[PDB]
Design a protein around this nucleic acid. Sequence first.
RNA 1: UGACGGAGCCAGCGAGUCUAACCUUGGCCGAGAGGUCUUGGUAAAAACUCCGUCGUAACGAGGAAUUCCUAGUAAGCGCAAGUCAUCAGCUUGCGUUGAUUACGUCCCUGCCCUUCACAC
RNA 2: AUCUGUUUGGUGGAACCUGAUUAGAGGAAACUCAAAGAGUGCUAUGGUAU
RNA 3: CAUUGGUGAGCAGCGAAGGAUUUGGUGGAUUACUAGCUAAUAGCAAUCUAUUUCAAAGAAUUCAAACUUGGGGGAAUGCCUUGUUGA
Lengths: 125, 94, 282, 50, 121, 410
Amino acid sequence: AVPSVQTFGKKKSATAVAHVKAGKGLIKVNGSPITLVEPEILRFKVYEPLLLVGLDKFSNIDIRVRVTGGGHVSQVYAIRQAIAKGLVAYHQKYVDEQSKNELKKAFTSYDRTLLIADSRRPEPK
Amino acid sequence: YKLDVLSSVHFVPKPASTSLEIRVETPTISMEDAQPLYMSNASSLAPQEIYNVGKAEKDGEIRLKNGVAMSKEELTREDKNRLRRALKRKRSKA
Amino acid sequence: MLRRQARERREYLYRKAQELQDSQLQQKRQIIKQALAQGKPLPKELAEDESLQKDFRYDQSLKQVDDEYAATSGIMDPRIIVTTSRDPSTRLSQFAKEIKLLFPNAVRLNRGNYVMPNLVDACKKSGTTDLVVLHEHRGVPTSLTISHFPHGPTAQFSLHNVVMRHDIINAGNQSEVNPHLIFDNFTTALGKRVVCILKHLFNAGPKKDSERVITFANRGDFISVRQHVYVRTREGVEIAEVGPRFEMRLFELRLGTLENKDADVEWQLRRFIRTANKKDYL
Amino acid sequence: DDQVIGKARSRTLEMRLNRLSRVNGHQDKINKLEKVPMHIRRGMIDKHVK
Amino acid sequence: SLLPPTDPFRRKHEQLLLDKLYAMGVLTTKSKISDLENKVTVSAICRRRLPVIMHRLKMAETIQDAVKFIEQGHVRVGPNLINDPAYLVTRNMEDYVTWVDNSKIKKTLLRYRNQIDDFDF
Amino acid sequence: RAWDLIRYRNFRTFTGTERIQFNCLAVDPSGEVVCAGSLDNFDIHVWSVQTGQLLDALSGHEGPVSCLSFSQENSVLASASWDKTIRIWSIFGRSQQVEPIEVYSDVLALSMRPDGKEVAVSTLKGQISIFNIEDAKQVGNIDCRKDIISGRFNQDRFTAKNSERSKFFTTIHYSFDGMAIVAGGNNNSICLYDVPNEVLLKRFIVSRNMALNGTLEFLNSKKMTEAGSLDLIDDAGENSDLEDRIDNSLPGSQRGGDLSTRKMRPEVRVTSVQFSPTANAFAAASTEGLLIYSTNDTILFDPFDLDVDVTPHSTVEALREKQFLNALVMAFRLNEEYLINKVYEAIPIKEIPLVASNIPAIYLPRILKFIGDFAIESQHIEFNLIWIKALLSASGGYINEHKYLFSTAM
RNA sequence: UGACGGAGCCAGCGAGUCUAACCUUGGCCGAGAGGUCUUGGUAAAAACUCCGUCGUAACGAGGAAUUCCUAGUAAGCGCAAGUCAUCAGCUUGCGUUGAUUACGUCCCUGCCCUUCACAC
RNA sequence: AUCUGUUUGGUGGAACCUGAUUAGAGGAAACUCAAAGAGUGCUAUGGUAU
RNA sequence: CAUUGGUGAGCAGCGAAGGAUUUGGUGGAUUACUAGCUAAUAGCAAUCUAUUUCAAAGAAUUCAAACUUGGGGGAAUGCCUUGUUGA
Ligand SMILES: [Mg+2]
Ligand SMILES: [Mg+2]
Ligand SMILES: [Mg+2]
Ligand SMILES: [Mg+2]
Ligand SMILES: [Mg+2]
């Protein structure tokens, strides 16, 4: 079977499901290229993982992301978290663990929200 | 004992209860185990425990916890009144 | 956490069901004890029950506040959160503050966009004992619901003839001592249940000379609430209103947190039954 | 009743309970001799009568 | 029981013994003191064994199936994997019984609901 | 329970209201507040040492509190739980604040850097994650799952590689310098990691005894039979004495009773580890006992900034020519203890205050370590005290600036 | 920090065979009741992103005093439901976008509490 | 028929309730190996023994 | 349009007298290598046993011996203990 991994990203009610499989660098969001994600002002937000680790790593995989719920911003954050988590999971499962560590180090160095869900749970005081 | 071991000692503590112990003054070395070394030398009773300055034995004398002793003949009338009021407060809080 | 609360509640519900069954056996043991002490013959059903007589030997050495409050009644002081409906008007915010000052251990929390299931879960984590939510209509408070954690009950009230302290000029500041509590004319079993819920909202053991008194007076199921400060004089006692005034009438009481709309209803107000106006339940 | 301990308290309670039961409880059901085999029981009665 | 009914020692110890057994889960209820003689049975202690508690918690279809999973190292109580099928789980410990993180069983549960997240594993 | 060592008395005992078992404990640096956590309560009780009263019960965890620790400097309290979170409590101060930090998995152990600026936590995934307290953001991560050595037990029906019994670290601790972490768990390994570069310095096998259950990864196929493992067959019947034959084991026990209660072989595990405050050594409690690992022998040759001109022969003339400072510095560069000792005792007392001021700052930590190790068992009490007086007076300011570099030596 | 038009696109609550106008002009059938049609009047996701066009009597953001408020908070936007009390002159839920400033101090103003080691 | 929607048969078997069972329920092979139950067949014939 | 659903029909590429999947049996390892048997200060290993027997030594009033039982209530006849009758 084709090697594949699945991951989830969540921000408020926005949920993104990312499938990462062996491939030829085909990144899609809701059946469209990643370049067409909107709003354009926040597009680079979704690009943040792809640029942090370099496009070479993506050149060998296809990523398909399906997003539902929430608004524009929450969907953008869901997409980026899903892409990062899926990439790290794929490098864990079907590539060396050293690359996994390098990816985790880079992402947590830049923004830990890319991996850990940001849940603003209420705190009575 | 059997129930605790059976449950892997995930039991629930027992009710707390208060009990009295008698501590006998001894050199601290005696409390230790037997080998050619000791790790402390002090006594097993603190200095307060040996002697606590309490009420004056003589009725006329008034003795306080700080060690100050005043005989009633010494004390001026304002002092006698002041000490009596302080005794009233100390009794009331107890 | 979530597993334990589910497991504990299931254990409680099982315990109550058994106790209702065990009520008959408890009465039977009482009859046996009376007969032995007085010497009267036992009834036929008891006289022929060999199992009960054997089991009575062990059960001979067997011996209030409501169960939910029994664990912490008078041991831990209550912790209270007072909140409101979404987008509260200004008057409700002032009213919510007054309720916060009424209860010594209350804290006022802003409900902007807080989800109700999230609200209880946050409060349960932080050890909150009771939660109070207020509703309003054109800046006039209309309803008040009190929910006791971790598993209820939830009591909902309707507030009438509300007169806040902000309507008073040069009123001054309140005193926040542990107040004395007066619960008058609560007789029925439901009345005792309502008293227990309202009593435990306050800290235990007010000082004997505390000069603030809170009174809940039931008059035809319309519980009047008043707050006074008193001075003991040489020929009597004089008292002064501190407010606020409002009359609060129970209309529901459920065995569960206010989030759970599925909680079993302990008591509800039936307004359309034929004999509704005849009897007063509290 | 407070001082009595041991078997006497177990036998005392049973005697009291039976006495109250005899008034209303049917004779067959209130008192039932414990089951013992044939050969033994005639042995106990014969010695006891002796 | 033979001690006099009003004795403080009798009431104290009997209550302690009821609470201890109830906490272990051997006794379902703490109300009646007769339960110590009537409702204390080997089956009561057996029902608190790890294989049965999973079956009641529906982690397994049958007791025999649940025993196999323990011997397969799929079951943990707290952070400690358990291979002994005689672990007596108290009432408070019953909350922490769960599958192992990387167990194939746990993957099937999440896969069946389409909730498998490979970052966790 | 609080113990006073000078008089061996239980001078104070604390107890919770709700009758809760305690598994973790942490004490304030000031020795005035004591907090304990439980596996049954989800709350961190806090008491006052002086009065013994329960100050408050810290709440907020949705899982049992697995560990606690106070910051030696900042005095904050860091708590971690199986709730997959870590919470920093500012209990001291007029206002109380709580700052939760999320983690990938359950937290089992926690250690606080002596600086009080970072906290390391071991998770059930086998990860030692270091967080910055003030910023509440991660600053590093160390993998451990591959490093851990875990053995198949005689009773298991699954391999060690697939076994998930213990691939995490249940205890950890920083070196007082702050650059190293020593970790151990329910396993046959004590792993020493270096924090700044996130690498495993060394791994230590706890035991090599086959009597213990967890020692071996691979078991002998000869022991397996149709009946089963020959080890699992109980041979108590053969024993001649009755007290040997009698079996007192309860069916389901795992811990908290005598070995006879178990019926199963002891399992190799390290309950806790710690570094030595005074010496370069660490102690690890295990089933067999407290294994103490030390560097005292120091047979190693570890020259520092050595050159061709430096030689054990060359050092001796520097003494013969009365160039004590050059002799002493060259002695450290070789880093030979016997040579450092030779120069250390040959320097006259008149020249000690001169030499002490002129030692390069780099070698100051080494000499202080040597004097500490040498003075404890050496017979030259006054000579060392002259040295210690000389060094502290000359380089007292430098030591104060770098506290944690000199902590163990001081 | 506009108006007009077009284009792109994102929520979560909610499921009782239950869900919803008024007044007229006239044709035909019908014993009646009524049936059917005809006819005029009255009433009754948004934010956001991009593109194009124009263009900057009373009242123009509201005095003095006074009230409230610390994080998914203040504020803005819409969509549902009407749950035996209250509510439609409206009430309660739901999601979306989402900050500034403090998180110290007892100086002022109120309220409150006090007068088993080692070390002090 | 971007008609209508009842009925028959097949597929599927949520909730409640009832009954039985419970080291979950089955299936296939035989010149296999056991432990039992029922019926049937056979002059199955020393009333006192060549 | 998408299948990270199954079953097939064929390329690109890889590619030295073929390639892939499963499986029975034995051997060596899985603890650190001082040789076999016996009546053992030596014989045997083809065994003797047609010297293998004698001598010497060797017997606690411990003449005690269930540390070994699921709980409650009894135990006719047994068994244990104590006393007693008559030889
Ligand atoms: Mg608002
Ligand atoms: Mg609005
Ligand atoms: Mg409103
Ligand atoms: Mg503050
Ligand atoms: Mg093979």
